Amino acid sequence: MTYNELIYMVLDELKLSSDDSYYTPDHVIFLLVKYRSFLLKQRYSDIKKQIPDSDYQSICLDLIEVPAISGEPCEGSSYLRSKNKVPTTMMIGNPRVYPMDFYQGEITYISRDRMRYVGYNKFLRNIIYCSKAPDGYLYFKSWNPQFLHLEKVSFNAIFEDAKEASEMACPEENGTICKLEDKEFPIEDALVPPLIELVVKELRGPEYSPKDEDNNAKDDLPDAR
Amino acid sequence: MFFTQEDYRKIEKWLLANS
């Protein structure tokens, strides 16, 4: 399913069809993207369960070599990093950075804290490690100077913001899908009816609430105007 | 190698080239 189908299901359940409606489809996109992460955490955080393939998305990143701090000699070895800021993954799925082929290569996505201290094991000196720095970029680290030649990776994970990771979606065979509404929403069908129910409950009450409608330099909500 | 005569003639031609 696509963003369009979910959005218009929510709108039609709410009957927000007129262009002169207070709650636009943008409210629907916001609520859908947040309630998706809410439901996924509620279902896949208590105890470890199988996560379907629908909850995931693949972003494609372009890597650039950057200094550790600045251009000094003693400031440590350089890191690669994605050109643009990367979405934050949830901790419920199977995050994986792969070199444009999911079935090959070993690039390990680890925590920020762990990546401070990796590769000291002599047999793990050739493994590329990944983490999202507080800067918001995906930083790469390894002890094997060959890693700095890496130019492109794809990252598959259950990203915490469907909109961000869908905007960073990888080019399809036909070409890029410009409109977000024509892209595919990241959620299993078994979680779609609950998601629509939660969003529709969220906006049902506000839909029929009064407005401060008189232009009279006055607050008109206490009078239910 | 097994040089032919004509190859030798080429070699001396190019050596006497800088005569």
């Binding site: 070199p99 290569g105 050739n126 590329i128 890693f147 030649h149 890496l150 492109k152 | -």
Partner: protein, 107 residues
Amino acid sequence: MDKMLEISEEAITRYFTTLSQFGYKKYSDVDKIIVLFFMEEMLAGEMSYYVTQDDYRNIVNALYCLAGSTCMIDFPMFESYDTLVHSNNRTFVPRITEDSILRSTED
């Protein structure tokens, strides 16, 4: 040679292409790349004057261990028109149904 050049260029270009796609190449194969280009500069330098034909035999038969060892190095292809069993296109043309004292004859 002019061919060790081509093989070395191909090998190192493939090496850096892999380091572009992936971020890792086996150092057991970087060893083969090192040996290959070291040999080519050995043979295309001032040290090509110390080689006999026996040394040439040994060098070629040792480099052919690197041929299919990794994807970077390939088996070179030369222009060949031979095979282990050749075709017989000779034609038979006897003289007016004649023979020699023991056998047949032709033109």
